[PDB]
Amino acid sequence: MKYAFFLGCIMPNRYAGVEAATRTVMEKLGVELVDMTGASCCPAPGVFGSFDQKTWLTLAARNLCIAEEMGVDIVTVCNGCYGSLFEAAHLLHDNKEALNFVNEKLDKVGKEYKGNVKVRHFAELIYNDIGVDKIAEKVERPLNINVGVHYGCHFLKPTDVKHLGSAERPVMLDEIVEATGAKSVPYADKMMCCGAGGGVRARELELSLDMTNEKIENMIKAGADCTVNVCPFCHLQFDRGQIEIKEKFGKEYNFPVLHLSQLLGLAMGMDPKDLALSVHQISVDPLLKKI
Amino acid sequence: PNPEMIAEVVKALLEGKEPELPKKNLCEECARKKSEEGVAIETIKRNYEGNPDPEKCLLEQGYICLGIATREGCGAPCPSSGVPCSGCSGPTDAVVDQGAKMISALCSDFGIDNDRDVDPMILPKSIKDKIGSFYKFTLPSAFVPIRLK
Amino acid sequence: MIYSSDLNKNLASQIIEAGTPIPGDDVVSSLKACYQCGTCTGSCPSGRRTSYRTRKVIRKALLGMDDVLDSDDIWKCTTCYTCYERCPRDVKVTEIIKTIRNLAAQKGNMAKAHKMTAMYVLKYGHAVPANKNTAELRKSIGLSEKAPIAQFSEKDLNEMNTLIKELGFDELIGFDWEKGALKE
Amino acid sequence: EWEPKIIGFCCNWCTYGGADTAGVGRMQYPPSIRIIRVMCSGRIEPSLILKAFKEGADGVFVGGCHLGDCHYDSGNYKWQRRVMMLYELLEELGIEKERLNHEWISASEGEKFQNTMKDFYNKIEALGPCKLKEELDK
Amino acid sequence: EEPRIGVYVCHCGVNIGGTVDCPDVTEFAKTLKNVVVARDYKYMCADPGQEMIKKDIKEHNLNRVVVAACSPRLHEPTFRRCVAEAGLNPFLFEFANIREHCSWVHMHEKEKATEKAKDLVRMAVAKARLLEPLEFIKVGVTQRALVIGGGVAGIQTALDLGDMGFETILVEKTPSVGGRMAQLDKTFPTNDCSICILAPKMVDVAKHPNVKLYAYSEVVDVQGYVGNFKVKIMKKARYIDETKCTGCGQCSEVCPIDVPNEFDMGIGMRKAIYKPFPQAVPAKYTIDKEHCIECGLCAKVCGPNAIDFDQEPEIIEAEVGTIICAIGYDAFDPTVREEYGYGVYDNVVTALELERMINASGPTGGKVIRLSDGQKPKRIAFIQCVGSRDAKVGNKYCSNVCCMYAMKNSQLIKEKSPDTEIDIYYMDIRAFSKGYEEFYERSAKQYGIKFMRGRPSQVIEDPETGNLVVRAEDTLLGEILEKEYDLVVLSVGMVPTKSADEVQKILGISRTPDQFFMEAHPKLRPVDTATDGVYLAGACQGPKDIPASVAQGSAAASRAAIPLAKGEVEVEPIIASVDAEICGGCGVCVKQCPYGAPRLVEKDGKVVAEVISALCKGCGTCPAGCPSGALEQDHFKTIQLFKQIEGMFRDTA
Amino acid sequence: TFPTNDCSICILAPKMVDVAKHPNVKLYAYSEVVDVQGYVGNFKVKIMKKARYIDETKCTGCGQCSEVCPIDVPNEFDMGIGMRKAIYKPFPQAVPAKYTIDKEHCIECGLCAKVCGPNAIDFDQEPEIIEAEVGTIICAIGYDAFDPTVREEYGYGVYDNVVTALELERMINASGPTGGKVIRLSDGQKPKRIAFIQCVGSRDAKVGNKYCSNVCCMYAMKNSQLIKEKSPDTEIDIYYMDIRAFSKGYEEFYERSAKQYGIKFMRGRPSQVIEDPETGNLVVRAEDTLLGEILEKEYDLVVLSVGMVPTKSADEVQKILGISRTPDQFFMEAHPKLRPVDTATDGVYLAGACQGPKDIPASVAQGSAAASRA
Numbered sequence A: 001m002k003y004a005f006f007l008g009c010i011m012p013n014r015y016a017g018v019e020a021a022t023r024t025v026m027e028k029l030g031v032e033l034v035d036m037t038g039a040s041c042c043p044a045p046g047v048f049g050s051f052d053q054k055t056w057l058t059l060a061a062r063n064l065c066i067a068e069e070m071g072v073d074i075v076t077v078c079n080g081c082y083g084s085l086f087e088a089a090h091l092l093h094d095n096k097e098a099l100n101f102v103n104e105k106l107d108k109v110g111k112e113y114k115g116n117v118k119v120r121h122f123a124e125l126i127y128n129d130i131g132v133d134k135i136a137e138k139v140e141r142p143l144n145i146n147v148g149v150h151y152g153c154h155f156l157k158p159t160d161v162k163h164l165g166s167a168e169r170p171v172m173l174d175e176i177v178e179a180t181g182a183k184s185v186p187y188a189d190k191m192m193c194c195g196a197g198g199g200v201r202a203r204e205l206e207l208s209l210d211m212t213n214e215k216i217e218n219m220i221k222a223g224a225d226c227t228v229n230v231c232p233f234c235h236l237q238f239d240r241g242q243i244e245i246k247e248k249f250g251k252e253y254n255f256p257v258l259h260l261s262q263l264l265g266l267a268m269g270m271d272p273k274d275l276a277l278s279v280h281q282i283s284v285d286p287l288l289k290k291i
Numbered sequence B: 001p002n003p004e005m006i007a008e009v010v011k012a013l014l015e016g017k018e019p020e021l022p023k024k025n026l027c028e029e030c031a032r033k034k035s036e037e038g039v040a041i042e043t044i045k046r047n048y049e050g051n052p053d054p055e056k057c058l059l060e061q062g063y064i065c066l067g068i069a070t071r072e073g074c075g076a077p078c079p080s081s082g083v084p085c086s087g088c089s090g091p092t093d094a095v096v097d098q099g100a101k102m103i104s105a106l107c108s109d110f111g112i113d114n115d116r117d118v119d120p121m122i123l124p125k126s127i128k129d130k131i132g133s134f135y136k137f138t139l140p141s142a143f144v145p146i147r148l149k
Numbered sequence C: 001m002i003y004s005s006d007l008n009k010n011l012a013s014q015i016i017e018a019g020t021p022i023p024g025d026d027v028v029s030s031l032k033a034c035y036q037c038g039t040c041t042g043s044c045p046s047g048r049r050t051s052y053r054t055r056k057v058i059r060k061a062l063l064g065m066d067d068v069l070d071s072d073d074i075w076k077c078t079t080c081y082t083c084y085e086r087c088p089r090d091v092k093v094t095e096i097i098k099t100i101r102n103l104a105a106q107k108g109n110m111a112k113a114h115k116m117t118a119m120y121v122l123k124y125g126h127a128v129p130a131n132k133n134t135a136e137l138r139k140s141i142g143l144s145e146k147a148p149i150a151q152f153s154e155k156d157l158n159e160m161n162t163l164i165k166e167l168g169f170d171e172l173i174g175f176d177w178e179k180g181a182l183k184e
Numbered sequence D: 001e002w003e004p005k006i007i008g009f010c011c012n013w014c015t016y017g018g019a020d021t022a023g024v025g026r027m028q029y030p031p032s033i034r035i036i037r038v039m040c041s042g043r044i045e046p047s048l049i050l051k052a053f054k055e056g057a058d059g060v061f062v063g064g065c066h067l068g069d070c071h072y073d074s075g076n077y078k079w080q081r082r083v084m085m086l087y088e089l090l091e092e093l094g095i096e097k098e099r100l101n102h103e104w105i106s107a108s109e110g111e112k113f114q115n116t117m118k119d120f121y122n123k124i125e126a127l128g129p130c131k132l133k134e135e136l137d138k
Numbered sequence E: 001e002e003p004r005i006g007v008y009v010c011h012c013g014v015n016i017g018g019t020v021d022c023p024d025v026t027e028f029a030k031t032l033k034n035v036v037v038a039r040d041y042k043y044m045c046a047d048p049g050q051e052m053i054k055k056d057i058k059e060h061n062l063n064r065v066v067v068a069a070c071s072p073r074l075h076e077p078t079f080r081r082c083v084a085e086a087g088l089n090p091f092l093f094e095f096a097n098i099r100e101h102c103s104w105v106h107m108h109e110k111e112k113a114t115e116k117a118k119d120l121v122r123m124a125v126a127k128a129r130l131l132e133p134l135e136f137i138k139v140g141v142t143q144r145a146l147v148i149g150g151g152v153a154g155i156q157t158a159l160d161l162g163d164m165g166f167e168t169i170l171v172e173k174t175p176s177v178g179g180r181m182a183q184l185d186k187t188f189p190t191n192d193c194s195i196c197i198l199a200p201k202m203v204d205v206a207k208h209p210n211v212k213l214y215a216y217s218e219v220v221d222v223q224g225y226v227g228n229f230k231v232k233i234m235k236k237a238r239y240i241d242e243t244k245c246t247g248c249g250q251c252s253e254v255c256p257i258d259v260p261n262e263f264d265m266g267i268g269m270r271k272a273i274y275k276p277f278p279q280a281v282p283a284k285y286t287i288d289k290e291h292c293i294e295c296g297l298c299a300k301v302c303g304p305n306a307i308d309f310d311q312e313p314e315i316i317e318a319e320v321g322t323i324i325c326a327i328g329y330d331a332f333d334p335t336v337r338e339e340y341g342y343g344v345y346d347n348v349v350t351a352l353e354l355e356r357m358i359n360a361s362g363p364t365g366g367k368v369i370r371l372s373d374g375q376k377p378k379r380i381a382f383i384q385c386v387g388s389r390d391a392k393v394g395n396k397y398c399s400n401v402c403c404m405y406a407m408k409n410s411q412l413i414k415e416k417s418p419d420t421e422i423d424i425y426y427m428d429i430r431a432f433s434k435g436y437e438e439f440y441e442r443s444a445k446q447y448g449i450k451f452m453r454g455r456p457s458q459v460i461e462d463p464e465t466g467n468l469v470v471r472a473e474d475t476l477l478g479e480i481l482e483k484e485y486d487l488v489v490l491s492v493g494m495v496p497t498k499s500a501d502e503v504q505k506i507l508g509i510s511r512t513p514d515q516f517f518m519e520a521h522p523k524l525r526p527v528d529t530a531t532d533g534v535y536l537a538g539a540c541q542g543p544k545d546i547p548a549s550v551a552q553g554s555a556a557a558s559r560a561a562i563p564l565a566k567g568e569v570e571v572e573p574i575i576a577s578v579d580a581e582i583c584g585g586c587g588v589c590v591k592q593c594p595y596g597a598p599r600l601v602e603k604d605g606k607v608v609a610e611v612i613s614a615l616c617k618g619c620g621t622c623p624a625g626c627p628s629g630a631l632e633q634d635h636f637k638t639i640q641l642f643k644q645i646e647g648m649f650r651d652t653a
Numbered sequence F: 001t002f003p004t005n006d007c008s009i010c011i012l013a014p015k016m017v018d019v020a021k022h023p024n025v026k027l028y029a030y031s032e033v034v035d036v037q038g039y040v041g042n043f044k045v046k047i048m049k050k051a052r053y054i055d056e057t058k059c060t061g062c063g064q065c066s067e068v069c070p071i072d073v074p075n076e077f078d079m080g081i082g083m084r085k086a087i088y089k090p091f092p093q094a095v096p097a098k099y100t101i102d103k104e105h106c107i108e109c110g111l112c113a114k115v116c117g118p119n120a121i122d123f124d125q126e127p128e129i130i131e132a133e134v135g136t137i138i139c140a141i142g143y144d145a146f147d148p149t150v151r152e153e154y155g156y157g158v159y160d161n162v163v164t165a166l167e168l169e170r171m172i173n174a175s176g177p178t179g180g181k182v183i184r185l186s187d188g189q190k191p192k193r194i195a196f197i198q199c200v201g202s203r204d205a206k207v208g209n210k211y212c213s214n215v216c217c218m219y220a221m222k223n224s225q226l227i228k229e230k231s232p233d234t235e236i237d238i239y240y241m242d243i244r245a246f247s248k249g250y251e252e253f254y255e256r257s258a259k260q261y262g263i264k265f266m267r268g269r270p271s272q273v274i275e276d277p278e279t280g281n282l283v284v285r286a287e288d289t290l291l292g293e294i295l296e297k298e299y300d301l302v303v304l305s306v307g308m309v310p311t312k313s314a315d316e317v318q319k320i321l322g323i324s325r326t327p328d329q330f331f332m333e334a335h336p337k338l339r340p341v342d343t344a345t346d347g348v349y350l351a352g353a354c355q356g357p358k359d360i361p362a363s364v365a366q367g368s369a370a371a372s373r374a
């Protein structure tokens, strides 16, 4: 299994521990990660897709060409990047007018998308190709904690193009998290948005925090010890959002936020130092005393 | 054309009569045994493959015999001599394209006993030289008489 | 009171035009299949805590109320795709909202924060670029001091800068290359 | 300037009805095809298809009942065996496989018929004209 | 004889003329060889158009006619009658489809639509030249009818045909007749018990001198054509002698096996030995062997000793002239609309499950209770359009009856329990027939039933109480509602019955986009199918209510009675025949026929193929596969199709 | 005709032609039943063959007479939108294809007899009373369109550009008085903006019609599609309460009307229609119930989707047959479900719109159902 690793922005430049965790976890599961030299912002669809669809797709196609030139598929650990590149790719394969538009612009740079790139999400790649059983085989330290699983919206949706099963009652992440020994607690409005998507975090911060607060509150009521996501954007919203909720509304939860690769990492027998948990706005130390 | 047929034609014109060619396909004249239930082909064989039964119809045995899409009159010496008909007398008066009609017939009876389940890709893959199999003597008179380049 | 003089009969067609060829004429023209059932509004996470009503956006597009382009409400959509997924008339709701946002952006209705994020992607190539603390954090956990990304490749940074100029995205956000910042 | 010349063979019970349904529904599609009615796709054979190419067809379309839905129980199974051989015979004659298209379209599948006509027109239009008649007239 | 053609281009008002330049197509037809006269008229099928054709056939001594208009599948029979009245053989007439196949699909390309119509006219003219005069095949009609499905529609067809004096066979799949109507408590708009209208009809159909009822039976095979159908009916084994059984029900009281009753939609239980419902007809019992353990307790109790475990199924062979399909429908399974929680939440039920709960003789004794705790719900929500008007489930049609049955069942709940809060979440209230709008007014005015215009986004259960919350926008207030209910009823739509695919194959009939059976024409022939001798009646033709179903059953009886009363019908002479002078007996044709019409015979001391005219349906498969050209089907000869192909590119000579 | 959008002629004209030449059908056109005595199986009927003042046997329907007639009479078939002559044929595809003279307006100038080759005109012709014995009677007298003059706030009969949907059917008809052109009656111009007002004379207690007329949602969407086919730039709005597209292919026809033809729908029953005296344009006052705002959009033409009411002659037929009426005033079936086409009077059946508001598919089904019952 050889895949071009799209990093994005938030993971490599801020929550770099997610990158280290993914690198090791994917190596342990028989996956070779190749560098996408020159890869830029996916670009973030919240701003780019809302500002100009033409510019979002052209820059997304530019990044798809980098993996196409290498002759490998793409793998990402972000719903934002997954949604941006997967939907960009699907559109260039399905719509000839959109492909022709983009290629006229890409021709000015010396690139041309040909439609041979497949975009994968590591959680989906783990479930469908590798197998959940292979996760459990590599568990060195079983995690005896309750996890508030946050799928995020851009992982399974739009279902018409993603084809990763139901986005209403999914089981994918619940089984991957449970392989580590953790328990995926059912909580109210489990499939709702964290509130950051569509550039809402930046434009309407209070609105985004109201939704994050609802999710955190619901997870806590369900006995969750932490939250697990598959998106640095969700991660930032749950982690930094808690500081912003404390500052604006005075509500304190001290609810640890982890990316699935970091959770998997701990179970694989990784040193929490490599996971860069000290970079998190909300300390994960209380959770480390429970695992 | 057999000598006797050439004489009959010329003799008819000498007598101010209209020449009449035989109208049927070769199976009537052929001495091979045909099944009352009809033709059913299980597999397609090249002329060198297997060992043909000298009494049973060669088409029923899986060999491409053009007798079905060829006018009678020759006496069917080829099947009688142990080899399938190559269709050298050409088609009947009711068939313009001999090869097209032969292909139609062959495709229809191929796997007819397992009609709904026979894989339709078997026959095309079995015949490596389609034009040479069905148009040895009549390519120029076919609907598509050339290879486009 | 709403008069015919207060409406734009071509609003829907103008939204479809903007959505052609990306995300597609078929995709954005789906707004014409809406039968105002409200499934989108009841599914909206943002509508539960604001005055935002998803079907009113589609209603205003069909009715011709162009004030929808000046609306703060269209920017409350998180693009969760729940409306898109549940619409019984196959209206590609989330895509129509994004296309409406494109016309709102063209008219100047863009937030500084979004314009700042767009500027970081053309200048540094990334919405969240690397800082001095990144280099320190990355090397401390076994990673390369600098990630193999556009931020450190003048080749790829120039490629994007050529595309941004060809698309006119620099003019859209109001970015000047001599000044090296967002004008006005 | 040039518009492809397409000929269609549609069975009365299903595809001819499917073409009728597209019409009743005002489902627009390109005006290159001219449909010929037959009672069953089982009536179609290589001679008719090859005859269409000789006359100047850039594309040939054949529509029948879904496998198992033939009005005459199994006529479409015979046609399916014939068309598979025909695709390869055409390639040997230098006629692109893609200039022949066969589909199973029911009596009410107007949308499918419409989209099939659009797709087949774009495929022939992209291939350009068939030069058979140009070469035979020389 | 040299052909003399008359070409007639129709405008169909503006349906053709608005896109295609008909007068130009008419002048083009005049340039074609053998065209003596060419004319265009607004409506060729109308009186002036038909007389115009008949006049020219006589006046210009025409021997061929071409009509460039609609599809032959619509008016080929009408123009055939028209030309035959003027003395022209009906098979010397050819249709050019320039409406469905041209004007209606090339509206935005008028110049190319016109060019195309000219080619289609030249193609019809080309085939016309080589058409031959043929004679319609006169066939006898067996004086007997077959009705498939013993529901309200099927019972009506059988009672009407029987009342006219025709022998009729009524086949019913389950142990009893009655259909879904029997499962309903009351019926809108009168609010009569379904029993009131149905039970007397079930009683009558089971004792009718001209009706042979085959309950617990299925049609397993149908061969033949109009007036001459050969049918095989599988009388399934009840493992009880109907002649000896008295339906006393003593056996069911002692049976130890409990099986979920299918009639009660998985709410109520029954025994391995059972009767679908107490008013079932025939009033006989049945043993379900899937669950029967052969304990023998029912036989000790059975006085007439009617129980017979060794009983085997019987295949009955019947000859019939006409067939009526009245297999009804099945309720949509809302498990797929996951946001509503059907199959997850206990208190989310379908409207058909409610019909059984509310029914006086139902499993709860007419009590509407929650499954979670067996309590009576004080607050109920009805969710409309479940599995209808929905592209996500693939059902973009209106199920017709769900607005009315939700308002009806809501009235019943108010009659039984006036304090109950009832809300109906709808998009459009479709109370469109006689007394329906009034029933809707009365539901709100007299019964206090509330209506929320808003399609719900989702249903959510409170895990501690089992109560449900309905998330929906009140579109008339522009606000989001989150009302709590004790029970949620999904007004499920109608889908074809599970066995519809089996019946479709047996009869050889088509389906409309909604998947229900297809009528020949929505207005020309609403209960006929394109397959002669096969008709439709009831919900299997499309979602509808009882009044409409009964009307269709009566309409299907009239349509099916025509060929029976006539005692003779004409069938198309498009049959295959061998030219014995060309056939050398290669045997290629024999196995290609599904009906075995071609046979190798000996004529003049030589083997030759010969077609049994009666077994040939006219598909054209063996002529297409004949390598000698000896086989030709009339009206679709190779030479006729060859001319038609040439016609697209050029004129003859 | 919806939902197929076939010409009404396509399905009807061949059936009219067939019924007029059927060996077992005796067609008495321009005739009325004036008396019915007896009971089931033994009815004695008197049919008055009204005088056309033209010999049907000699007449060839050439129409030369109508070109020279000096009397102009409003065409009833064209709903007052067209003028016809004293000597006339209802429509060009009429069956029997014979002419008739309207004596109420005929002045006996004699010009038509001068152009009548077969000399078929006969002013001395008298009506004939035919006596027939029948076993069963089927009533299929149809319906009449509601007269919206009573809903005064809509301005029908006051404003020139306010028309009924049945008047539109005639304006839009290829063989209509305008040659298939939808024009304003004020200036003869084609309207660029049209409004359809639903439930006119239906679902209304103020006019005494609390029933649904069944077909007006579908015919408003249909006629709106035809206007879009003829003139794509036309702005069309349908003011409705509920869209009742309930039968096979109807919901799809409604989806298609909006998606393919761009027809707009306003959920709101209009309060009133107001004319601008200077332009003849109309304004429709209505609340968009889905926005909670009041609309006052201007239109060049307003079409009232009038409901169905019993035919004018229904009272005469009711008395002759001895049958009852339901609260909607249409004829009463023995039982909505037990016997939908029978009446409580044995030997008398019902078929079509006279039994209640319905569409063509339903009417044809009832005609077939009544044939079985009779």
Ligand SMILES: Cc1cc2nc3c(=O)[nH]c(=O)nc-3n(C[C@H](O)[C@H](O)[C@H](O)COP(=O)(O)OP(=O)(O)OC[C@H]3O[C@@H](n4cnc5c(N)ncnc54)[C@H](O)[C@@H]3O)c2cc1C
Binding pocket: E148, E149, E150, E151, E152, E153, E154, E171, E172, E173, E174, E176, E177, E178, E179, E180, E181, E184, E186, E187, E188, E189, E217, E218, E219, E326, E327, E328, E329, E330, E331, E351, E352, E355, E401, E404, E405, E408, E497, E499, E500, E503, E537, E538, E539, E540, E544, E545, E546, E547, E549
């Ligand atoms: C919840 C609900 C409430 C309703 N309420 C009303 C109401 O109040 N008023 C109203 O008018 N309508 C109502 N309807 C609609 C009504 O049920 C139908 O209009 C009516 O039952 C149609 O009758 P049918 O004979 O066409 O079909 P069905 O009633 O479905 O009967 C079909 C019959 O055919 C049999 N059958 C099926 N397959 C085969 C086979 N392969 N071989 C032999 N037999 C077969 C079945 O066993 C059954 O007996 C309601 C529908 C639902 C779902």
Ligand SMILES: Cc1cc2nc3c(=O)[nH]c(=O)nc-3n(C[C@H](O)[C@H](O)[C@H](O)COP(=O)(O)OP(=O)(O)OC[C@H]3O[C@@H](n4cnc5c(N)ncnc54)[C@H](O)[C@@H]3O)c2cc1C
Binding pocket: F001, F002, F003, F031, F032, F033, F140, F141, F142, F143, F144, F145, F165, F166, F167, F169, F215, F219, F222, F311, F313, F314, F317, F351, F352, F353, F354, F358, F359, F360, F361, F363
């Ligand atoms: C504007 C409008 C548009 C419509 N569009 C459509 C559509 O697109 N599709 C559709 O399906 N339906 C449509 N409808 C409904 C459709 O017109 C009716 O369903 C249909 O005409 C009913 O047929 P009928 O024979 O029962 O009644 P009618 O068509 O009214 O025929 C009744 C006949 O009986 C005759 N008659 C009356 N009184 C007497 C008497 N005393 N003695 C003898 N004869 C008498 C009349 O002259 C008439 O010919 C529309 C209705 C309207 C008003």
Ligand code: SF4
Binding pocket: B026, B027, B028, B030, B031, B032, B034, B056, B057, B058, B059, B060, B065, B066, B067, B068, B076, B079, B084, B085, E586
């Ligand atoms: S062998 Fe060739 S020719 Fe002789 S019978 Fe079989 S097919 Fe006809």
Ligand code: SF4
Binding pocket: B066, B067, B070, B074, B075, B076, B077, B078, B079, B084, B085, B086, B087, B088, B089, B090
């Ligand atoms: S090949 Fe020529 S000779 Fe030999 S059998 Fe066939 S036709 Fe007769």
Ligand code: SF4
Binding pocket: C033, C034, C035, C036, C037, C038, C039, C040, C041, C054, C055, C058, C083, C086, C087, C088, C089, C090, C091, C093
């Ligand atoms: S859901 Fe689809 S149809 Fe219902 S309102 Fe929202 S968009 Fe319009």
Ligand code: SF4
Binding pocket: C040, C043, C044, C045, C046, C047, C054, C076, C077, C078, C079, C080, C081, C082, C083, C084, C093, C094, C097
């Ligand atoms: S996508 Fe935008 S609008 Fe549709 S639901 Fe999520 S947020 Fe509300």
Ligand code: SF4
Binding pocket: E254, E255, E256, E257, E271, E272, E273, E287, E291, E292, E293, E294, E295, E296, E297, E298, E299
């Ligand atoms: S035998 Fe089978 S059926 Fe008769 S009682 Fe014992 S179990 Fe119930």
Ligand code: SF4
Binding pocket: E240, E244, E245, E246, E247, E248, E249, E250, E251, E252, E284, E285, E301, E302, E303, E304, E305, E306, E307
């Ligand atoms: S079986 Fe014996 S017992 Fe059960 S009912 Fe029929 S008769 Fe009475």
Ligand code: SF4
Binding pocket: E384, E385, E386, E388, E389, E397, E398, E399, E400, E401, E402, E403, E404, E428, E429, E430, E491, E493, F246
């Ligand atoms: S009847 Fe009422 S509920 Fe049933 S589908 Fe049609 S509209 Fe929705």
Ligand code: SF4
Binding pocket: B025, E578, E582, E583, E584, E585, E586, E587, E588, E589, E590, E598, E608, E609, E625, E626, E627, E628, E629, E630, E631
């Ligand atoms: S296929 Fe043609 S030739 Fe062979 S037997 Fe049948 S008819 Fe005679």
Ligand code: SF4
Binding pocket: D072, E575, E576, E592, E593, E594, E595, E596, E597, E598, E611, E615, E616, E617, E618, E619, E620, E621, E622, E623, E633
């Ligand atoms: S034509 Fe079709 S049906 Fe008639 S015989 Fe040949 S194969 Fe059998």
Ligand code: SF4
Binding pocket: E010, E011, E012, E013, E042, E043, E044, E045, E046, E069, E070, E071, E075, E099, F007, F009, F010, F011
């Ligand atoms: S039906 Fe066919 S023939 Fe009659 S008018 Fe419409 S098109 Fe011309």
Ligand code: SF4
Binding pocket: F068, F069, F070, F071, F085, F086, F087, F101, F105, F106, F107, F108, F109, F110, F111, F112, F113
């Ligand atoms: S006579 Fe009466 S009818 Fe003849 S023209 Fe003079 S007016 Fe018209």
Ligand code: SF4
Binding pocket: F054, F058, F059, F060, F061, F062, F063, F064, F065, F066, F098, F099, F115, F116, F117, F118, F119, F120, F121
């Ligand atoms: S003129 Fe004489 S014939 Fe010609 S129409 Fe008038 S009446 Fe009938």
Ligand code: SF4
Binding pocket: E432, F198, F199, F200, F202, F203, F211, F212, F213, F214, F215, F216, F217, F218, F242, F243, F244, F305, F307
């Ligand atoms: S059908 Fe539509 S318009 Fe006609 S009354 Fe019922 S609702 Fe009003």
Ligand code: FES
Binding pocket: D011, D012, D013, D014, D015, D039, D040, D041, D042, D064, D065, D070, D071, D072, D073, D074, D075, D076, E619
């Ligand atoms: S009838 Fe359509 S393929 Fe046989």
